[PDB]
Design a protein around this ligand. Structure first.
Ligand SMILES: *[C@@H]1O[C@H](CO)[C@@H](O[C@@H]2O[C@H](CO)[C@@H](O)[C@H](O)[C@H]2NC(C)=O)[C@H](O)[C@H]1NC(C)=O
Lengths: 49, 49, 34
């Protein structure tokens, strides 16, 4: 029973899985956002150039 | 491929049941990727996927 | 989000083992050990 409470009253018990998911999401978000960088070019839109 | 007030984008222009601000212009999402563009003629919103 | 990033070829392929199958495996292990 205590085990359930040890999870019911604590939200940090799943720290490892949450951290892994957050890291994956952040990596994907950064990869997507990198598409909006000029990288020294005139613009970041293929049609524009 | 649709040309909406300067944006040339390839996608499907479906119908979206979302309430937007009175003054209507383009849309965006979390990843800074367009996901909904206005209809200049009728005050109805269209999704892009 | 994972489901909101499917715009630039980002395809999140499904896992081979569904959560139900993993639950069944865990239940079988529990029954066997008990
Ligand atoms: C844009 O112009 C069209 C063309 O007239 C307008 O269409 C009318 O829209 C009203 C409102 O629903 C209808 O009652 C009329 O029957 C429509 N007529 C035609 C010929 O389509 C439209 O309303 C205009 N939109 C805006 C926002 O001004």
């Amino acid at each position: 029973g205590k085990i359930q409470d040890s999870l019911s009253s604590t939200a940090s018990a799943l720290g490892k899985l949450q951290d892994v998911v957050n890291q994956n999401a952040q990596a994907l978000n950064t990869l997507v956002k990198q598409l909006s960088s000029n990288f020294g070019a005139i613009s970041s839109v293929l049609n524009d150039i | 491929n649709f040309n909406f007030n300067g944006l040339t984008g390839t996608g499907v222009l479906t119908e979206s049941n979302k309430k937007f601000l009175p003054f209507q212009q383009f849309g965006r999402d979390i990843a800074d990727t367009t996901d909904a563009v206005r209809d200049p003629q009728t005050l109805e919103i269209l999704d892009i996927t | 989000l994972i489901c909101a990033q499917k715009f630039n070829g980002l395809t999140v392929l499904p896992p081979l083992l569904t959560d139900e199958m993993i639950a069944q495996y865990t239940s079988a292990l529990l029954a066997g050990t008990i």
